[PDB]
């Protein structure tokens, strides 16, 4: 089988530049005349969409933003100017023979100017603690790098191991990203403490922003 | 015109069979191109799987030729994929595509599936209440399998929403949360409600988030 190899992994580009994604053929994709490669960009919970066919060729309805070179075994998509809308993964693909196989991918994330979190706490609803479980949400909305530090305390006392946090991909507007964290507790250790804070650090922030809220 | 859509069961046991359908609308299958199958894996790797032609000839990935099939309804303009006796690594977002010889143009929706022995659940759906800018949200709490789907206000809202990737919590039930964004001052005069659709458990859930 043909081995398509991707590179860079990810690369964060700021806009108006140029992102420049290689992808190399452990043999010829070229074949007949024509070079079987092809170019995809893929947002979360969509399809893949393809950007270039045949190596060089742009698909009707994208941007010509997007260009794609090469033959053999090198090929590279060059994307001129990146805008916010281009957060995205990217996959090579050839169709040479069978089995057809694809790149790794590639994340474009879009550089931005450092954002701060916007930090919010939810206490669990009446109706969920009806069910024996209470789930702390903390939200940190719009935020840029995504590299965050979420804290939970409990009665001023640090917790670990029961809570979960989730991303979400680069915002396509406003290149920013939104992090949950959720602290579950039985409703039974929910009752028995008082205060419930989260403490988020981001550079973003000059010294960490805890909010809480005193259950009643 | 060109349309593709994938149909299938969204959970399967290990070890018996899944079985998918292509709906082609605006094209006829026997008129040209080869119909793929392509799928997706947890951690993004996409793998061609195989395909039928116009003509019926079948051409499939050497890795799965053992218990891959690749058939049709032209009649119905359908195409099928069924692969036996399935296990985890089986569990993937599946799509079906066109190929004309030139370019991938045409491709579905994609359909998850999760090869688990777990019984469907559907999600119970908790208010994040809101107590400048001001957040709300809703917690899609204790469902299986993969996905659910969440809009707010009947999709009239859309601005500032963001719906979090679900996490395996440790009971092997997923939760999710979907939170949005609005005016401090809106909050006495905007309703709001998230809309949530768990299709395998033919659950859909409006739970209105009222401020606390």
């Known amino acids: 089988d043909i081995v398509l190899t991707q590179s860079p992994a990810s690369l964060a580009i700021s806009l108006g530049q140029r992102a420049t994604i290689s992808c190399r053929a452990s043999?010829?994709?070229?074949?007949?005349?024509?070079?079987?490669m092809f170019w995809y960009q893929q947002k979360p919970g969509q399809p893949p969409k393809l950007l270039i066919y045949?190596?060089?060729n742009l698909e009707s309805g994208v941007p010509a933003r997007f260009s794609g070179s090469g033959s053999g075994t090198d090929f590279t998509l060059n994307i001129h100017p990146v805008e916010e809308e281009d957060a995205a993964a990217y996959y090579c693909?050839?169709?040479?023979?069978?089995?057809?196989?694809f790149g790794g991918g590639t994340k474009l994330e879009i550089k931005r100017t450092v954002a701060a979190p916007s930090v919010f706490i939810f206490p669990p609803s009446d109706e969920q603690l009806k069910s024996g479980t209470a789930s702390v949400v903390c939200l940190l909305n719009n935020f840029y790098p995504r590299e965050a530090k979420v804290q939970w305390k409990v009665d001023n006392a640090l917790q670990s191991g029961n809570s979960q946090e989730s991303v979400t991909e680069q915002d396509s507007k406003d290149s920013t990203y939104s992090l949950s964290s959720t602290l579950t507790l039985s409703k039974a250790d929910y009752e028995k403490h008082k205060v419930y804070a989260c403490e988020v650090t981001h550079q973003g922030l000059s010294s960490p922003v805890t909010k809480s809220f005193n259950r009643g | 015109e060109v349309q593709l859509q994938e149909s299938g069961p969204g959970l399967v046991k290990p070890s018996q069979s899944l079985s998918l359908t292509c709906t082609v609308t605006?094209?006829?299958?026997?008129?040209?191109?080869?119909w793929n199958w392509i799928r997706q894996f947890p951690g993004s790797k996409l793998e061609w799987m195989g395909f039928?032609?116009?003509?019926?000839?079948?051409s499939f990935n050497p890795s799965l030729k053992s218990r891959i099939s690749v058939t049709r309804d032209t009649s119905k303009n359908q195409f099928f994929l069924q692969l036996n006796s399935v296990t985890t690594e089986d569990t993937a977002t599946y799509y079906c595509?066109?190929?004309?010889?030139?370019?991938?143009?045409?491709w579905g929706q994609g359909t998850t599936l999760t090869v688990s022995s777990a019984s469907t659940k559907g999600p119970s759906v908790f208010p994040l209440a809101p107590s400048g800018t001001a957040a709300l949200g809703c917690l899609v709490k204790d469902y299986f399998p993969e996905p659910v789907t969440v809009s707010w206000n009947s999709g009239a809202l859309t601005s500032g929403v963001h719906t979090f990737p679900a996490v395996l919590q440790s009971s092997g039930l997923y939760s999710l949360s979907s939170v949005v964004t609005v005016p401090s001052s809106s909050l006495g005069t905007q309703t709001y409600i998230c809309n949530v659709n768990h299709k395998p458990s033919n659950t859909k859930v409006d739970k209105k988030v009222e401020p606390k």
């Open positions: 043999k010829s994709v070229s074949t007949s005349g024509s070079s079987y």
């Open positions: 595509a066109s190929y004309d010889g030139y370019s991938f143009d045409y």
């Open positions: 045949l190596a060089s």
């Open positions: 605006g094209f006829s299958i026997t008129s040209d191109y080869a």
């Open positions: 039928i032609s116009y003509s019926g000839d079948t």
């Open positions: 693909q050839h169709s040479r023979e069978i089995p057809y196989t």
